[PDB]
Design a protein around this ligand. Structure first.
Ligand code: HEM
Ligand SMILES: CC1(C)O[C@]2(C)CC[C@H]1CC2
Length: 397
């Protein structure tokens, strides 16, 4: 028997702690013998679990295409995820258009805005002594930042979350497609507005950009809008939710971050290794052998980053959160030409969120009378994290 045979990133067995990590540890153990295995899920596909094997696949862009970046494919109608859904030479030209606004200097500009937002959000429930850290904080900090990056109203987060849920999880395909079509209608209106009144934001930037002398198509612009929306509302929210959950019960980790705030950035990196929400797919375009396995054109390989990030041949003591770990070359943000555009931004966001939360609410715990819930999928992490804490004071009003 093999754990690969029924591996399915949308249906990972959960342990008594509520996470898939016992299952990830068991699959990591099996991957020491068999680092790539066949899953019968989704009609049959390859599951790549060893660290060196994921590296080999993800570097081999001639055989492994980002046309398969989401598997099963995210619901984005006839549109594609810009950059993430493309291969070179096209990929490189599009990524060049937005490299500057995601540079460390450009994203550092938002540090105090995130700090103020985190505190304003905390203000909303600190007097109540209870709240869902996911829906109250982890969802809202990136949703508001992302609305700002895209030049959208920050108070409409539930609308944006409804779109992202349709893209990633709504099971009825007619419903899903129709809600994504609502995103498209809103993006069209935004694009038209920015054409006449261009702002400082990233949409305005790509709308005014040119490639090889020509302006981008509306379809390309909607692809930019969609992937940047997903990065915040999905990936970042699920990561931060998992982090808040971990800090709620792991009183040892928590006291060390409070005693040593200078270790928070390295701790964020180690939490990214351990709770990194993402996996990605690759479409096989040429016959290719990786280790013992020969893959054929039209097959898909799923890169199970959480398993590789636990590989004993790549990390010492991989099942422990070692906040001083370095160089920590985990695969949670990918590797090679598609490595996460938002890497610096999410590091700033996580550092500020953790720093301010632990400053305001150093004492808290999981609510014994409400359930936590892990969301499974290509982007996986806590969805509900009910916590309790002593009632406190607002900084404002
Ligand atoms: C914890 C949060 C995040 C995680 C774990 C994450 C993870 C990833 C991963 C694994 C990839 C590689 C894709 C591949 O190899 O096919 C990637 C690429 C990408 N990410 Fe992130 N992401 C996060 C947040 C964000 C945010 C906040 C943004 C932007 C607002 C963003 C924008 C992008 C883009 C545009 C790409 C494609 C880059 C390219 O294809 O060259 N991500 N991300
Ligand atoms: C799932 C994952 C990793 O996140 C986004 C934002 C980037 C690459 C893919 C698809 C969308």
């Amino acid at each position: 028997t093999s754990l690969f045979t029924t591996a399915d990133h949308y249906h990972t067995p959960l342990g008594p702690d509520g996470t898939p990590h016992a299952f990830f540890e068991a699959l990591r153990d099996e991957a020491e013998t068999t680092p790539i295995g066949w899953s019968e899920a989704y009609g049959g596909h390859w599951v790549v679990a060893g660290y060196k094997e994921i590296q080999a696949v993800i570097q081999n862009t001639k055989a492994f295409s980002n046309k398969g970046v989401t598997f099963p494919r995210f619901e984005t109608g006839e549109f594609e995820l810009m950059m993430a859904g493309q291969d070179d030479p096209v990929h490189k030209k599009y990524r060049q258009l937005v490299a500057k606004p995601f540079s460390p200097e450009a994203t550092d500009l938002f540090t105090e805005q995130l700090r103020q937002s985190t505190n304003d959000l905390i203000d909303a429930r600190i007097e109540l002594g209870e709240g869902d850290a996911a829906t109250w904080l982890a969802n809202e900090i990136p949703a508001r930042l992302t609305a700002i990056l895209l030049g959208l109203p920050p108070e409409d987060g539930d609308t944006y979350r409804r779109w992202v849920w349709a893209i990633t999880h709504v099971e009825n395909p007619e419903e899903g497609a129709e809600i994504f079509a609502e995103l498209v209608a809103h993006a069209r209106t935004l694009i038209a507005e920015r054409r006449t009144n261009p702002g400082n934001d990233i949409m305005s930037r790509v709308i005014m950009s040119k490639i090889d002398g020509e302006s981008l198509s509306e379809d390309d612009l909607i692809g930019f809008f969609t992937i940047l929306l997903l990065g915040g509302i999905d990936n970042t929210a699920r990561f931060l939710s998992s982090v808040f959950w971990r800090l709620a019960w792991d009183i040892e980790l928590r006291r060390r971050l409070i005693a040593h705030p200078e270790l928070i950035p390295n701790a964020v990196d180690e939490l990214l290794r351990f709770y990194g929400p993402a996996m990605v797919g690759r479409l096989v375009t040429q016959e290719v052998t990786v280790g013992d396995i020969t893959m054929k054109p039209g097959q898909t390989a799923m890169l199970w980053f959480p398993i590789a990030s636990r590989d004993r041949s790549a990390f010492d003591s991989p099942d422990n959160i070692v906040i001083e770990r370095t160089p920590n070359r985990h695969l949670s943000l990918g590797h090679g030409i598609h490595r996460c555009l938002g890497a610096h931004l999410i590091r700033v966001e996580a550092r500020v969120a953790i720093t301010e939360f632990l400053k305001r609410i150093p004492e808290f715990s999981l609510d014994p009378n409400k359930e936590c819930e892990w969301l499974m999928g290509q982007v996986a992490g806590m969805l509900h994290v009910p916590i309790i804490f002593p009632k406190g004071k607002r900084l404002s009003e």
